[PDB]
Amino acid sequence: DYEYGVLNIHLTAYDMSLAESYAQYVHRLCNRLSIKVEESYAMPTKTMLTTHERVVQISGLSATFAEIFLEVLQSNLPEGVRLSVREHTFKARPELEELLAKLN
């Protein structure tokens, strides 16, 4: 019994618009699947032509869940979209006051 680490997916596609559709589409599927998405950040253009790469954060997975989920990505993965799987690497006033008591 072990829990997978939070793994980012770098979605690299020629067109951002197609990349955006898949990123949102996987997100909504992720939300239905109870996959938490902390961030959906986008990398800078690969200027030389250009290409667009978008990160959809995926946090939490199970061995059975991963096997079924990863395959579903294959079918969902649309025309000329390249997947990627990688392991992952200012607090406001109300938070500050609570922490002060803890460390005092």
Binding site: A63, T64, A66, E67, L70, E71, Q74, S75, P78, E79
Partner: protein, 193 residues
Amino acid sequence: WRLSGALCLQRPPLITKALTPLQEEMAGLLQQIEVERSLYLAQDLEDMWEQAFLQFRPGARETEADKKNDRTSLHRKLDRNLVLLVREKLGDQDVWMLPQVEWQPGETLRGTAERILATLSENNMEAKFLGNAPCGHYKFKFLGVKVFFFKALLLTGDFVQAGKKSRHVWASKEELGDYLQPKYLAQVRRFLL
């Protein structure tokens, strides 16, 4: 107890299916609105580029047109996944079976699962395992017996001698019921994609 293991291999579809007509009309609709909301001899160039498309042929979405009968070939289907399927004969049964092998406690399911990949294919085919969790289990009694159905994906296939004397048949979904009648073998669709 009679320990027997088996593997439900999966082959990715290389080329995507074409869009349905209902999608095609929707594509026109989204394109039309896109032009509306967008912010605002070339014919010879179009002719040069259109023939450039013609001269270089694209990979056929289905490589079946030439074959029409190559069940034993790894490229049975392209738009959908394939499953290895080999005839087997038992002492008390003679049925078309998913590739089966004998396993021992010394070998883990993955070790047997790896052996299934190359034992009944006697080639350098390349497949990948995602997890050790199995996908099916079916028991037939005459004496205790059990068959474990695993799952794997075919990265690439170096299937030399496509015309083997063995009866290996690649089926996506149509031939599963045709070849595997009993639920113990006709229910393989439950964990098949």
